[PDB]
Amino acid sequence: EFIPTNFEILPLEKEATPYPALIKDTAMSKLWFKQDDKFFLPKANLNFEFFSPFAYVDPLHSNMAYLYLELLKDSLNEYAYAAELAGLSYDLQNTIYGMYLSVKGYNDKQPILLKKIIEKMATFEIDEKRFEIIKEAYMRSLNNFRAEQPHQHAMYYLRLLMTEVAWTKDELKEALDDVTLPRLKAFIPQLLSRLHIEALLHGNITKQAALGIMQMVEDTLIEHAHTKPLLPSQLVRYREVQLPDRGWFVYQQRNEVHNNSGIEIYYQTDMQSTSENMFLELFAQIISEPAFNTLRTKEQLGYIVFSGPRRANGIQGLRFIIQSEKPPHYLESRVEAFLITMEKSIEDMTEEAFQKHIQALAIRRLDKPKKLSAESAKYWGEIISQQYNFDRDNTEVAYLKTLTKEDIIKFYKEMLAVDAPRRHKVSVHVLAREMSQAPALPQPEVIQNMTEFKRGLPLFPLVKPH
Amino acid sequence: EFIPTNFEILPLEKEATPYPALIKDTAMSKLWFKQDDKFFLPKANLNFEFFSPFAYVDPLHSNMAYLYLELLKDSLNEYAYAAELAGLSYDLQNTIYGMYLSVKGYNDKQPILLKKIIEKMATFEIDEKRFEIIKEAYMRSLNNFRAEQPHQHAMYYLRLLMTEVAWTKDELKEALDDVTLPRLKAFIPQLLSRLHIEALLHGNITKQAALGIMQMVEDTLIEHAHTKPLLPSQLVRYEVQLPDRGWFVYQQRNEVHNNSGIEIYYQTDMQSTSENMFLELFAQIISEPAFNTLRTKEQLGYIVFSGPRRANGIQGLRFIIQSEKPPHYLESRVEAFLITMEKSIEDMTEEAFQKHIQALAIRRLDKPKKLSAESAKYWGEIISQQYNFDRDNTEVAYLKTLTKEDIIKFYKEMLAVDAPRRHKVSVHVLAREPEVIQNMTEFKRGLPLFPLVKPH
């Protein structure tokens, strides 16, 4: 049971800052917490950082850690049934950085069960049959994936063609052929040998108790396996690749089962600066309603048609989760027809189209939280991109006050055109199971050695900091 | 166990190429192969790299690999005194990519002896305390490493700020406390289950016998520890993007030596035939007026030197200068010599131009002397994966294309004070006692990176 009656709403201190602040920082600690204002709730929601370098280095050890988390969160759920049944949810989630931890819920037993979870995942024991059955279950799950939907597997190539490295399912499939339990079983404390944990906290709790809870969990883990602090010289992030400034490249993927031919486009404006956010979103909104009016509705190229944003490596962009049975080059020509449509529509965006358009994106943008976790996921998105300007949305409003009609001339010429000298266009064909003005397009290449493809190209700058 | 007896030399067959040829490539093996046409000597020298992803793992894994090879080469040396007594030598050396193997001497019984070497380093037992003495010895060595020369530490800067990532000696310092013997003793089969060996063979040697020898050796390797191959993207490579005009520097005061170190670096590019003769000719064309005035006339310190950088398949420009001076003061002197060459090259007429490009030619022009020197240049061809064995005549013919105006084109685009390709950067070292660089984290925080070189 563990006493949930301690629900008295804590009044905010003299330290009244409008956001979670870096209230505790050491070589191990980095602590972030503001409490409830719009809700005044007994719950609290929690967001927790894990990093290991080993979580990006091997398909073998990734499968290891993946199934490790599987049998692990599998285990204490027999305990945690009643507690989360007592309205105390939590999350263990694989990332490319490592795992992901997040806890939500009432202030019944939060530091206590918190500590129980920390100790439990800190020291855990393994059964060989349960090991091998979990192994075989996800083994049969692996080769299930080889026939996904073209838009789903297209999203896989989306996550695959926008990174530093991502190991394939074939990389995983040869890798499970040699897996033993003593291997990862010895490897796990080597796996967890050095970490930094950043803690995002929120709700009906105390600053000084949050300091003690942070010191608690770090001292607990040092007690377990003496996980030493990480290095700033090894906390690395990975970049998105630079095109040869007009070279747009593409390749094809003949599907096996589905006779629809998939294709999806992507672009690179710049970082989330003042200008480019509203550029991409407002542009996304002006390819929402007239394009939904025209291409999907008026042309009916196919059933699966999408047009929307795509944020990779802390860089936004523009995706089109569109699937039909067309010649994809012909469908590109349709796309180019839509680009000429937008060419005519630059001046044809009137005063009213602009005003309704900016106010609808503003209402899209402006939204107070309805949950204590609603803003927290978005804050977590700033966290995983290391941003922390929690009023950069106010900066977004200030730039939404700043776009002119002349800007989209400026945005089109060097960025959006075909003769665009700063053109960063991406497309990929995903072919089938069997598969009014034509501009002078430069013939793109075929992409065979993806290793040699992404081998020689540059990358993108990080932040002049805030 | 071995004496060389094959000295009746084997004549050169149908293969009419004068170079190391890639005759075999599997998922594990890749055999660039040559036979002897110059000197007809019964020695055969061997070159083998041991790439591993486990290279950049830790400063702990650095010392693992390092001290592993160290004691490892020390251990079989107890076996290898008959070979040392035979005068038939070898090499084991680490890389920031992995390890390196050389085998040298006569072509008779190198495969079988080599197989013994491979088998013993694969099946190797570990002594506890002997290792501890070695551990403490390299500990005291790293303790001594903080008291080394600023020019030696300047070359350490050359390996330092010119990568994607490295480890520091302080990182190396605390991690020696973390060393246990079962850690690496269990990490060796962790190590040896996946790494790479590219094969290079050269000598009075046949083809199919060499195929069988290399296949035998890798078969033994897979027999013991089952070394599974890599992905080609798993052979990835480590350099800092510039703003291309802004000049950057930091100081790191010395502890022991009272002299101050300084150097200004300039990356041009890859080793394109353009940038090769740019760098070489420009470096040597400033070298002799430097010998005229800065070294001889000024006499600031004795350790004053200028040279090129050739690493990562990437060119560079160095100035080995160690002397206790005020920093900006010596900066202004080097700047003054930049002005000196700016006028002096324009002052150099066609005569010294032609004699000096002839000097660079005869620098470049030298006949083979042994397999070792050509093989060292071959190894440089290997490590950046370029193999251009006939860039000699090519870069010479390119050298003929450079005029007095052509080098001015090389000046003002890149080397002017307002040049947009001003690749200017420095590192200060103080005594034993623009803008500033905040952090090395800030040094590698906000950056693009480079296109990579097409391999061969």
Swiss-Prot record, chain B:
Post-translational modification (record): The N-terminus is blocked.
BP term (GO), one: ubiquitin recycling
Signal peptide positions on this chain: none
Keyword Protease belongs to the record: yes
UniProt keyword list: Allosteric enzyme, ATP-binding, Cell membrane, Cytoplasm, Host cell receptor for virus entry, Host-virus interaction, Hydrolase, Membrane, Metal-binding, Metalloprotease, Nucleotide-binding, Protease, Receptor, Secreted, Zinc
Transmembrane region(s): none
Subcellular location: Cytoplasm, Cytosol; Cell membrane; Secreted
Binding-site positions, ATP: D366, K367, P368, K369, K370, L371, S372
Motif segment (SlyX motif): 324-329
Tissue: Detected in brain and in cerebrospinal fluid (at protein level).
Domain of life: Eukaryota
GO cellular component, one term: mitochondrion
Residue numbers bearing the N6-succinyllysine modification: K169
Record's function text: Plays a role in the cellular breakdown of insulin, APP peptides, IAPP peptides, natriuretic peptides, glucagon, bradykinin, kallidin, and other peptides, and thereby plays a role in intercellular peptide signaling. Substrate binding induces important conformation changes, making it possible to bind and degrade larger substrates, such as insulin. Contributes to the regulation of peptide hormone signaling cascades and regulation of blood glucose homeostasis via its role in the degradation of insulin, glucagon and IAPP. (Microbial infection) The membrane-associated isoform acts as an entry receptor for varicella-zoster virus (VZV).
Family affiliation: Belongs to the peptidase M16 family.
Record's comment describing the protein's domains: The SlyX motif may be involved in the non-conventional secretion of the protein.
Subunit record text: Homodimer. Can also form homotetramers.
Protein name from the UniProt record: Insulin-degrading enzyme
Lineage: Eukaryota, Metazoa, Chordata, Craniata, Vertebrata
Gene (UniProt): IDE
Full-sequence range covered: 529 to 1011 of 1019
